[PDB]
Amino acid sequence: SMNPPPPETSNPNKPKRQTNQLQYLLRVVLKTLWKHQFAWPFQQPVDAVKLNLPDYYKIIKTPMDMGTIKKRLENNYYWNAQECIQDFNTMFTNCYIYNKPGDDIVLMAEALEKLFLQKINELPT
Numbered sequence: 001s002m003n004p005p006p007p008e009t010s011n012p013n014k015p016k017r018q019t020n021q022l023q024y025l026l027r028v029v030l031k032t033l034w035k036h037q038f039a040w041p042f043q044q045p046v047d048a049v050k051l052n053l054p055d056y057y058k059i060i061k062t063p064m065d066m067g068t069i070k071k072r073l074e075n076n077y078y079w080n081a082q083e084c085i086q087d088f089n090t091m092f093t094n095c096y097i098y099n100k101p102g103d104d105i106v107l108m109a110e111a112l113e114k115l116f117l118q119k120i121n122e123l124p125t
């Protein structure tokens with residue numbers, strides 16, 4: 001099988017806006033995670049073809065990655081911050097579903113998730 005198309009990063013039917021919280025998600029949260037030593041497997045969609053995982057997209061029906069989130073933020077795709085937070089959580093959860101507890105990639109995702117929650121918590125009033 002081919003890979004699926006990546007998640008949409010624009011949609012002419014979906015109202016969009018810029019907000020202070022969404023700006024923080026791009027300038028602080030995404031930027032911090034993007035630069036982390038463990039970011040690289042998450043900076044683009046899972047290429048199931050390259051990685052020889054014919055079942056990845058049989059098991060993961062809601063794929064997400066930081067390259068997609070980066071583009072969504074840059075494109076002002078979202079209406080609210082909780083939509084973006086959900087995208088990060090989908091990304092982490094997909095990793096935990098496909099892989100086993102304690103796997104190398106799961107520990108990497110767990111470290112990114114800890115950092116993610118810390119940056120969200122730091123969002124100033």
Ligand SMILES: CC(C)Oc1cc(C(=O)N2CCC(N3CCN(C)CC3)CC2)ccc1Nc1ncc2c(n1)N(C1CCCC1)c1ccccc1C(=O)N2C
Binds near residue numbers: 040042046051053104
């Ligand atoms: C599109 C490209 C990037 O996709 C890749 C490139 C390479 C690969 O062989 N690379 C050469 C060395 C280089 N290093 C060089 C030294 N630098 C210091 C860091 C970068 C990094 C890139 C490996 C995996 C890539 N893609 C990938 N993308 C996503 C992965 C995932 N791997 N892993 C690996 C992830 C690892 C464990 C499971 C998974 C493997 C099996 C099942 C699931 C996953 C998985 O869940 N994820 C998130």
